[PDB]
A paper describes a structure:
We have been using the parvovirus minute virus of mice ([name]) as a model for studies on virus biomechanics. The virion 41 is built from a self-assembled T = 1 icosahedral capsid, 43 into which the single-stranded (ss) DNA viral genome is later packaged. The capsid is made of 60 protein subunits (VPs) with identical sequence and fold, except for their N-terminal segments (Nts). Pores (channels) at the capsid 5-fold symmetry (S5) axes are involved in DNA encapsidation, uncoating, and biologically relevant translocation of VP2 and [name] Nts in the virion.
Author numbering:
A (entry chain A): 339 to 388
B (entry chain A), E (entry chain A): 39 to 587
C (entry chain A): 389 to 488
D (entry chain A): 289 to 338
F (entry chain A): 539 to 587
G (entry chain A): 239 to 288
The structure:
Amino acid sequence: CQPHNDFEASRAGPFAAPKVPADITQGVDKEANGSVRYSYGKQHGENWAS
Amino acid sequence: GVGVSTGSYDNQTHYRFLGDGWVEITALATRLVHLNMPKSENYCRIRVHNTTDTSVKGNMAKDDAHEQIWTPWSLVDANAWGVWLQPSDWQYICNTMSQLNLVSLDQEIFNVVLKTVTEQDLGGQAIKIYNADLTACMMVAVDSNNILPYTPAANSMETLGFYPWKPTIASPYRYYFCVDRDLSVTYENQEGTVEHNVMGTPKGMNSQFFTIENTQQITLLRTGDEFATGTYYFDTNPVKLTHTWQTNRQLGQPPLLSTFPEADTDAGTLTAQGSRHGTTQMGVNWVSEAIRTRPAQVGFCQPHNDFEASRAGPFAAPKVPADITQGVDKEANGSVRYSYGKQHGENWASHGPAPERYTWDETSFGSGRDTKDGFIQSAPLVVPPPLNGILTNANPIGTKNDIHFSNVFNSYGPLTAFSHPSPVYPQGQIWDKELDLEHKPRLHITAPFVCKNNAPGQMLVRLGPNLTDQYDPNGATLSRIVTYGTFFWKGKLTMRAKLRANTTWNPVYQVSAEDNGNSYMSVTKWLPTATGNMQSVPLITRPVARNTY
Amino acid sequence: HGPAPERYTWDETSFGSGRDTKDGFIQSAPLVVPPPLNGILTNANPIGTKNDIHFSNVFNSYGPLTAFSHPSPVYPQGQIWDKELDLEHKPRLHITAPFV
Amino acid sequence: LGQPPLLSTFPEADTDAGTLTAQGSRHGTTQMGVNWVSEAIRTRPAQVGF
Amino acid sequence: GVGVSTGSYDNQTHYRFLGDGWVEITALATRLVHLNMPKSENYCRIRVHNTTDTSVKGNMAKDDAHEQIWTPWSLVDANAWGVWLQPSDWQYICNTMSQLNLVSLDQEIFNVVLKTVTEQDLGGQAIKIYNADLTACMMVAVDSNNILPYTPAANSMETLGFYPWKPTIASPYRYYFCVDRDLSVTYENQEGTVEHNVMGTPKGMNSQFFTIENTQQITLLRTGDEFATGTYYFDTNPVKLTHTWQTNRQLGQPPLLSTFPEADTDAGTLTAQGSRHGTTQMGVNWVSEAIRTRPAQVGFCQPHNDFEASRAGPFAAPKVPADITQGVDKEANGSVRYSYGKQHGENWASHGPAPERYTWDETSFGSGRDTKDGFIQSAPLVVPPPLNGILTNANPIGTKNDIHFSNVFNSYGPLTAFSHPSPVYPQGQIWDKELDLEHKPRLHITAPFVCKNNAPGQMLVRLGPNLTDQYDPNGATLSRIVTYGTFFWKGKLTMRAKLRANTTWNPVYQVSAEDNGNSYMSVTKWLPTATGNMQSVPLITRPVARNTY
Amino acid sequence: ANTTWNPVYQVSAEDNGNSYMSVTKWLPTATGNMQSVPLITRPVARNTY
Amino acid sequence: TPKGMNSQFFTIENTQQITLLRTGDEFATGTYYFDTNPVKLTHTWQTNRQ
């Protein structure tokens, strides 16, 4: 079990404490299991038509 | 025969540049020891159980309940950074070298002197006369096998003298014994007196009783004799002499700047948080310097004052020290506070039973925690933080207005990354024996260096019992002649270290000694007084900056 | 004779790593001798709208300083060796069998 | 673990026990900002059990 | 010259596994000795004849009538099991090893110290000052020829100290002399006072007078000198470290079972006693587990308290110890009782002239006797025991209601088979010199080990007489300067031993240390007190079971 | 090795009685029934420092 | 009742190397030698009288 969204703050400022990704199971808990979400561009993989 | 020295005095520090960036630093230290005939003729199993505090409902931490075994042997444990190097030297090392490790260590005992004191009435008074006793002899033993319980001299702050030109007394030897102590929990004024609070009786499964007489080869030496130990080698790993500023916030590639400052006043901007490349562990459609994924976790939230109890009794669960940050959370980050004496570093002018104390703050700015900013949010992470969809350090957790999540949260995970505790020059613990456990800790808070191999081996020492003319054990008549001893000690702690190079443009912070003033780095701090009093204050460890990525 | 098999509870011999829920507690950051009524969390404070669920039942003090021994293997019905898990980061040890 | 507190009092009989030094005025190392130490706040090499 | 040690302290025990089941055990022991200038300037022939008890008609055993020869020499006889090994060690040996024997033994005397004491008035009082005297010297002599009477230190319970960290005094030397003592027999209040009861005069056919001055090469050694003896070897046989349970009842093939138990409650049966194969020494036509012939005789009936008198006087005829059985017959089986002091094992807290005592009971369950069951039957052995055809332990034999056959019966025959007396860890006698007789005894009760070859050789020692300025033998003026001595002792008793193997399914009895409680095997028994007092209680010898057939 | 003065706890088999370390525990019965009960592991004491 | 100091329980299964042999198998032991002394095969008539 990993702390769901444990925002820890430091001298640099508040941040999201990383968490080892894992299966989502039937719980459909994505953000809870650490399922990373990406955001790329056109020169990185997005359709040039969009 | 007798009547001639058996050693040489040398308390310096030589630097041999082995090139390639590495330098071998040999630290020699010699001091005069003062040993008195132990009061305890034999091994005692004294049981100390303070009730002046344990009885009270409010007092819980002041539990000094334990049963030790006082032995008739002293101990010459010079495991202190200030008892080896010189005040000025440490400045050069920390400012130049970027890492250091222990290599070898030797010891020697020369000019052993044993004298007896007798009463002699002078004009009606009674002055003490001191006559040397050649036939007298002392006893030395170096348990390099560590068959006896390891007793760090720094753990009790009773090491040797940090002052070369000043003698020092060897701290008596004593180890803990098996005793089942139990203490109930009571807050302020709970209903009724404390429930349970009693000591324990010796068990047969944990009865650990050792004797210096049967755990080491005692070497008898008189006035003309001298002892010396082999060249022990350390297998400990080198400890970095630099601090880390980079926090979990700054690691990979910074956000692309869309706006460039026209003046030295204003700043630039980033890209559309909603429309910007990056990686976040949230299902949301936006990123920021707070949700962007990082290679690992810098530092971690530690349970604030987590007093765990065991068969031995309640105790404070140790916690890896770290930067205090702007939160000014000292006891929360584990900032260790010390308490030394005059023969350890306190000013000899400050007459009184009150010893000097200071709170050491880590330099690991990266693993710093801040309780005034820590919080959590509901699974469905949304920009607007609901009143119930967030847990700040102000929500009473457990029917308590002072007990929040921070005081009971362990963020230690497979991503936890931190530095080592910066060793202090004065009263600092150098090496330490590893625990005899299948899974020992990743590190020790007491001392940065941890002997992976066997331990150095504490050096025990006791004065030879000078019996009187009359003696009878069965009559409980242990008539002993008043006798003491003063032997010299010579040790060399050879250790190599590497020095960093100027890889930056902006001058890095250094450790300088400002003029005599309110400035902490005042010269008078380490300068003698009109009377001759002196004091040894902590030094800035890890002054140079270190990039953690 | 009977379908009821024999059972026994094995207790470790590691007196050093022993825990006691009847003594575990925490205190506020500003550590003061006199423990305030709200400046301490004993094993008697209902945590989570429950009178039987305290901090002890949900606290993991496992830290970089955690040091413990191995589970004493029993002579009867004791598991000797065991295969390691096919994982990047397998556990530091196994409870089923001392030998891995 | 480490060096036990220095005994200031020695038992005269096998019944009573000895004492320690002034908790407020005694050498040692504690992770608390307080001005006193004890067998409950003294720093240790590591953590035994958890 | 003088002013330097001449030896090393070491009181440990190393185990060298020679494989094949045999292990060489080397026991090193070092202690500090305290010798005082003997009061008797010369050899005395003191005659001790207690009449405070011998005169009485009832008292007969309290006959301490004898004439010894007090010599001005002490003796360093460390013939004790507790003065060699450590309390914990013995546990390991008895639990593992199944037999042990003595091999070699060496001794050494280093750090010889001799000081004199003088009176010095302090404020009207008179405190004693102690000044070392270099010119002073002691005298040592090891009679390896045994020309002098062998005087076991355990026979008088005056060996060396069993406590390493505690000094010890050497027991004075003295041997018996020829004297014809005679004592008549008197019961309670016999008619008239005791008939004869007088000491004797020196005879010319048994006058044995020896002198340490003419029976050994005295080696004079001062403060800077040191002595050492050769490596003496023992020729004694190994003693089993196990007990026997099998009695004369169980030996050969048990009776054939005709019935098999249906439940764990009931038992099986045998065959018709009248019609069953077997061998009995009776002319009867039936057999049983009481009349069946056996390979030999396990144990034997011994005369209970058979006081035999001789030219030297009445004495208690020794008797081989054995199991007490259910008869609880201690004094009847020969269970030896001891009486040691504080420097020998008694608690230092038990202040008083009353020494600790304990009755040792053998572990030879096989040779155990029971007076509450012993009996005899007429020649014509018949099932029905006639009132006159049997002699139970209740028939007044010799006009006495308390004197039966058991008190005066010696069943020692060519079939007598028994074990050896289990040696006790504390105050136990190790080796012993054999009697100079054509037919010496098959064994000794005092010590399990009996030197078949020559004896080790007691070590004598006396302080050198420090004469005064004035002296005159003819004027009976023996002015001696008050002087004492304190020399160290170092000995190594090397001995090999074999260990048994687990050849059974059911765990054999072992020697464990139960928690602090009423349990005899309590840890506190061997643990120091708040003051430092300690005691050494006997240990379970021969814990493992041994099959005798 | 014996590096202590006070005898360390051992595993012995007390006589037939209420004692857990009873011999009958590992001894056959009149019928032949037997049982195997757990044993005291790690009887010797170990110093962790 | 069974004592713990004299409890002697042995098992043929753990006290010797059992040799399994079927119908076509056969066993044989080594040549054991005796060290016993010879016994006279004659009687004595002479008594303490002659």
